[PDB]
């Protein structure tokens, strides 16, 4: 009920898998198109259960201070701020290592192009 054990690593793995799914489905070919592909990948990664959110912030791998002042919601609820922090951390981590999947997909599609036939 009020007890849960979810770590940041599970969230990161889920986000990584969803990013791979998005880049495969949408047929991303350029780096600038990755932004949105990352954004959606983060959207379906932040938990909505309050217990899970509180357990994630106590895990290892996520800091407790914002880096950009433009990503803080102007609200009175504390769930939104924590969700925004998780979203920013996931965005940074995913964008840190993202060209690998893009170039792998590009080389694979080049291999199986079969002379455009």
């Amino acid at each position: 009920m009020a007890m849960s054990n979810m770590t940041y690593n599970n969230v990161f793995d889920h986000a990584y898998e969803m990013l791979k799914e998005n880049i495969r489905y949408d047929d991303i070919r350029d780096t600038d198109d990755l932004h949105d592909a990352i954004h959606m990948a983060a959207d379906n990664a932040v938990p909505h259960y309050y217990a899970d959110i509180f357990s994630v912030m106590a895990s290892e791998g996520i800091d407790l201070e914002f880096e950009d002042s433009g990503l803080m919601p102007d609200t009175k609820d504390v769930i939104r701020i924590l969700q925004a922090r998780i979203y920013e951390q996931l965005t940074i981590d995913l964008w840190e290592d993202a060209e690998d999947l893009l170039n792998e997909y590009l080389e694979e599609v080049e291999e199986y192009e079969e002379d455009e036939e």
Binding site: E21, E108, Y112
Partner: protein, 1181 residues
Amino acid sequence: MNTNNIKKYAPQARNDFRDAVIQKLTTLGIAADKKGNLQIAEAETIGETVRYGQFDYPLSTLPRRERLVKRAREQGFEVLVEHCAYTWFNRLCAIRYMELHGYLDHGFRMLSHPETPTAFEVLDHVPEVAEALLPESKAQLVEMKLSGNQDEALYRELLLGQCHALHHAMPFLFEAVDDEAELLLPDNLTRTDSILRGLVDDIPEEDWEQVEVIGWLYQFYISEKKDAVIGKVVKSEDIPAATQLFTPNWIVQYLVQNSVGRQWLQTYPDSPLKDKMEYYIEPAEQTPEVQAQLAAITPASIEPESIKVLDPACGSGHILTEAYNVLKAIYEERGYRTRDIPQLILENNIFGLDIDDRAAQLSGFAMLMLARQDDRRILGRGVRLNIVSLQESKLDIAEVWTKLNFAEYKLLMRTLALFTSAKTLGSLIQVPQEDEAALKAFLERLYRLAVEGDIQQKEAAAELIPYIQQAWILAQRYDAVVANPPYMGGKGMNGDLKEFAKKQFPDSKSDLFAMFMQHAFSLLKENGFNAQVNMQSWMFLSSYEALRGWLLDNKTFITMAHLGARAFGQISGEVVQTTAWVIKNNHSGFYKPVFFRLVDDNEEHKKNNLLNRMNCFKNTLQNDFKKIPGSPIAYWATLAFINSFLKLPALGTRAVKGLDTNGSIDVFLRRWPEVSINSFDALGKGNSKWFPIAKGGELRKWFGNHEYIINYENDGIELRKNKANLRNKDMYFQEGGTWTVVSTTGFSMRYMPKGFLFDQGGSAVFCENNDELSIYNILACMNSKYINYSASLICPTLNFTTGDVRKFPVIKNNHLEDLAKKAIEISKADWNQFETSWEFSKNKLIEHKGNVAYSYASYCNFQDKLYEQLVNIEKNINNIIEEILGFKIETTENSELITLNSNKIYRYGQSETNDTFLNRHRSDTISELISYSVGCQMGRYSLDREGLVYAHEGNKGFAELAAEGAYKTFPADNDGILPLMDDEWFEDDVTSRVKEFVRTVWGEEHLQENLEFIAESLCLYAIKPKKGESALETIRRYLSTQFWKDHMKMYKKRPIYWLFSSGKEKAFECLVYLHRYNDATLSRMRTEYVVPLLARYQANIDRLNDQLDEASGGEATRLKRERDSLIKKFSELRSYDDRLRHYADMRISIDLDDGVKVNYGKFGDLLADVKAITGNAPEAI
């Protein structure tokens, strides 16, 4: 940390050497600008000296400077810099390695001194070294020691005397006569800031004990440039820098021991060499016919001096060492003097080639060091090594072929025109076999003239030797070719290289290692072996089908090891899978190879498994690979599967591709909820503009994935103006099957009804007009274990294309049709129970009667019944098929997964958390009920009729529909605006109408019990429980806190009900229906929703503030806190009213034909979450 020293040292050493050489060149009078054109200054001869710029030299360096200048103009400045740098680096490393082992004659260290750091052991025993190296000047050198100065000059003189002595032993690395490099040697070699200090003391002392340090130096010296030049189109000058690597030893031993040792053991079956080799693999078993053929073709006796080994890419020279070891063992077994073996081995058993000079130097040095490891009289006798580097032949000097002399001219001119571009192609050039003896004789004549003759003849012979030597090496037949081909795909496509590839190698033009394989086969002799290691992507791909077809009817497989990933010491290559193989040059169709499967392990585990010989498959002939379509090399299959694959028919031309728009999908594609249903073709006939399209999504079987529409008005005139293929025009608007092309989990096919289009991503299958088969039978066959296993085996990449699907087997039966029909009905019933489908009819809970708990229990029972029924149905399909073909198929991965929303595992994840899943399901169901209630209030649905009631544009025709009597049990709102606040001030409050809805549906007697049940259910997962509050308070808190987020998530950032919010404090919030918005909507909102609220706030502030001033108390601070927030609310509401009044003056007209994304940004900062939907920040006025 052992290799970490070399890793940290090598690139810095390269940079320092390059800096020193460029500085020396600039001081000499040669420089290059930013653009790259040379800055060759004019030489001035003042007299007795020279005047290069502002520097002087004693007139003796003029010819050498001229040679350097003429070399600079004919090729790259950077090329010269790099050549000099790595030449000096290699010379210094060789000197250090040789002096550490004590191979020098005088026995004194040259670059160091024992037990004394920063000291030299040659500055004290000067007379001995002087008389050993340079006797004639010996006495003079002694005088220098008596001077007490000129130490750097004496050391420089002594150091250059070693290279001249070593020139005789290894001519490929050192020179005797004066050369250009002596002018590029840095100064101050004995100071504390020199370049020798890093080499001497930065590397440890124990790292030079082995011989593998050469490979580390070869690999780590070029790492920075390799990393720099990877992500582009690599040109010819950077080819070596991009394809240089190192190979682990056990793979090399496995390759070598199965190609030379195999031949020797075939000739002599009971040799004592069997136990010397530990990676030798014995043949399994053979039929009498192949045994007789092999015995007939096997020779009787062979002499050790007739074995030839070639390495088309020498690199560091790792393979040649193992070949040397095996040949030494053979020679010792035959019986020879131990002092005469290395000479013979190096003379007439080892050959090699490469494209770079650095690799040639390193390979020669390694071979000589290995030879000296077991001999001492060597290095004092002239021995020629047949290891050379390819060079261009763009020189036709008048002096040569005119002064050289004292029939052959035809041969020379024919053979000199083949190497016009040899620094790009490499070892892929072919030389005719018939010109071998003549080339050998000409080379012998050139060798003879290189000693006896005048200066002109000697110079001409020294100029012409390398071309003839490389031609003779390349025009010879060998019986063993071992190599590690370089990897380069479609990025390194130089125009000349790819033109040559397409002209000469049509069947292997897609990469370089395949071309190397074909050329190696062409370079071999009859009854010869070819052993290599390359990447996996040539056995399971359709681009190499011709190569596999040509390889399976002309050669024979002997042995293969399937390494998989994570090999090569995990030196990058995360997506690199490799295999190693040995192939013979003869033909035999009834041979049984031996296969190993080492795909899932680590490097140490793989080595141990190969050493113990585990995971062996040796129960398949060679012709059996031709029975599977596409001829893939699947060694782990069984005979029954292969035999049964050809007993059934296959799909013909029933599979076709979909259309393809060239781009700009944001102007053609929409989701179905966000357009008027009058223009929708699926429902509401009369005018069609949008048509359903199939694109393919997640895994799903027999039905589902209906969530897109496309614009196809007037048969397509807006789409046809753009460059769109529109393939298969005449096959549209028909029923059939559909499947996703690029997937990630498995293969599945779904039913597709009429009135649909299919895209490139999701392709379609259509039955013929009067075909024997039926679509239901095809659907039944395509969703079984057999087809899933076959598809996984054929294409491991999970990229099922139409050409791949055009050869799947099909089975004809009668029960499969009805079973498939039942499964389709069940799946459709499961899919049509949510609001996000245009066939949604009614909510499930309101069908039953009694309590909410009873309805919830019945709903759960219904879902469980559907799930169990489908699970039972899917078993008979598998049972029937396994009786047609007499074998069983193993179950792996997700072959036992039911794709339904009734199954909680499918829709919530693999984790087994049933305690939380029994609360999450309940909370979601109650949330969906509340959403349906809000939809009924808005007017989208109704309690009288089923399906959508009003979804048109502009709120036109709603009055007539309402007056007809569509809503009579539960009336709908007339304005179209629903307030959402924390008081009962308005009559349109959402909570009050929710309570009215609950009272109307489930009666009056148990209203309180139902409200308590709903409030309890909401707090399990959606929100956090509170200490004490009623059901209505919980409902209001849920509506005001977490209803916008759930709605925005359900429709995937394409909301139907738009939220207008005042700001940080909940002063005013409202919901507006998108399909009932016109130009006179904001005016009504301002006129009769905001001004009365402002008046109420003013009155409440005036009343409340009065009573506190008159009477105070100890706990009267609560009223102060209550009154504080009202001022903030009033100010925020006033600001919002001003902004709304500004925006409402312009009569904004909206168009639903455009997307929600475009239209959501026309209202400024009046809505909520503008950035999360539109993608850009709202614009302020």
